[PDB]
Structure 1
Amino acid sequence: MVNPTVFFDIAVDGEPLGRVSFELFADKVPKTAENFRALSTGEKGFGYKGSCFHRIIPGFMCQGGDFTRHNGTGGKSIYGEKFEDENFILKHTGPGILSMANAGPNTNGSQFFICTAKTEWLDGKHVVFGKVKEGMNIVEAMERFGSRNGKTSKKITIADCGQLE
């Protein structure tokens, strides 16, 4: 069956920036794809709507998904506990790759990152589960609000999000 597509509507200090959409590789990493899909639709009662990208490092990645502590210390999966690395079949091949942030082996929650370059040193440590489909230019625009230590100069939020048909 067809890989799900998800959208994020991004804002910058509350002003709309644009829409980023993602293909989720449910064919390769179903548990991981399903956690991100469900957190994007908010169908379990919690998820990414209203959350922020808290750590953005230009030339590297944009990291988000901490909807409980807003700083990289929090977040939770849909499974009632952190979950295992599903596989490492897919690699960090370039800009647009969507991959799980974690605290080491088998500690996936809800935090994720969008690569803005090839980051092959993350292969085998972070589960790749999707890719930007449309709106890579919005991620490039977001990136410009990061910094060398990752602190953002403006608040970058997921004003809206959901699943696309």
Structure 2
Amino acid sequence: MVNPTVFFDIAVDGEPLGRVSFELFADKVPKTAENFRALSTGEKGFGYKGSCFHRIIPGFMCQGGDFTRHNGTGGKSIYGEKFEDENFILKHTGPGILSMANAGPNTNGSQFFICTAKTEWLDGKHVVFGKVKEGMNIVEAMERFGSRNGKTSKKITIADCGQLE
């Protein structure tokens, strides 16, 4: 019934920062929401714990989820290396939207991004599947460690993650 909620405990060069929680829209995009949920608990034997936000651009997005190559070239889903664009019902409306990164049509894996601005040009190209629930302040603090080209000035990690309730 109820959309699941997941959390990320963020650290900055190993130092705890705070918690970000997300609502996952399992009601509209169940296959995409289930992938992010399972990667957040680690219940398939792999996932987001210990991974980093490798590309942060202030006024745009924070991108993470590459737990196999640590730099934007890797990751895998719970369904195999890649899976299809499930639907484009939800749009990139503003800060806090959670959406899938990709390298072309039907190439979703584990990488994702949190919007820090409206990114409407991505509508119909990236699958939106959730939003920040609590901790947008923590996202804003992360965002300050980014740069124009995306390289971070300190290492931004998911020290822990899982499901709430």
What is the TM-score normalised by the length of structure 2?
0.99
Residue 155, structure 1, aligned to residue 135, structure 2? no
Can you list the C-alpha shifts for 1:56-87, whole angstroms capped at 9, x where unaligned? 00000000000110000000000123000000
CA offset digits 1:137-164 (Å, max 9, x no partner): 0000000000000000000000000000
CA contact (8 A) 2:13 2:155 kept: yes
SS in structure 2 of the partner of residue 50 of structure 1: coil
Q: CA deviation at 1:119?
A: 0.4
Contact kept in structure 1, 2:69 and 2:75, CA below 8 Å: yes
In the alignment, the residues of structure 2 paired with residue 69 and residue 153 of structure 1 have an alpha-carbon distance, to the nearest angstrom, of: 19
Determine the structure 1 residue equivalent to 2:100. 100
Count of residues in correspondence between the two structures: 165
Name the SS for the 1:53 alignment partner.
coil
List aligned pairs for 1:43-58, cutoff 5 A.
Answer: 43-58=43-58
**What is the rounded CA distance, in whole Å, between the counterparts of 1:103 and 1:131 in structure 2?**
22
Runs of 5+ consecutive residues of structure 1 not aligned to the other structure: none
1-side partners of 2:11 and 2:74: how far apart? 22
Partners of 1:88 and 1:104 in 2: CA distance:
14
- The 2-side partners of 1:95 and 1:104 are apart by 23
Aligned mates of 1:101, 1:31 — CA distance in 2:
15
Q: What per-residue deviation string (whole Å, max 9, x for no partner) do you get for residues 74-118 of structure 1?
A: 000001230000000000000000000000100000000000010
CA distance in 2, matches of 1:81, 1:14: 29
Deviation at 1:35, TM superposition (A): 0.2
SS of the aligned residue for 2:11 comes to: strand
- Aligned residue number for residue 15 of structure 2: 15
Contact 2:75 2:81 survives alignment (8 Å): no
Structure 2 stretches of 5 or more lacking a match? Answer: none
2: CA distance between counterparts of 1:152 and 1:104?
A: 25
Q: Distance in 1 between matches of 2:103 and 2:50?
A: 23
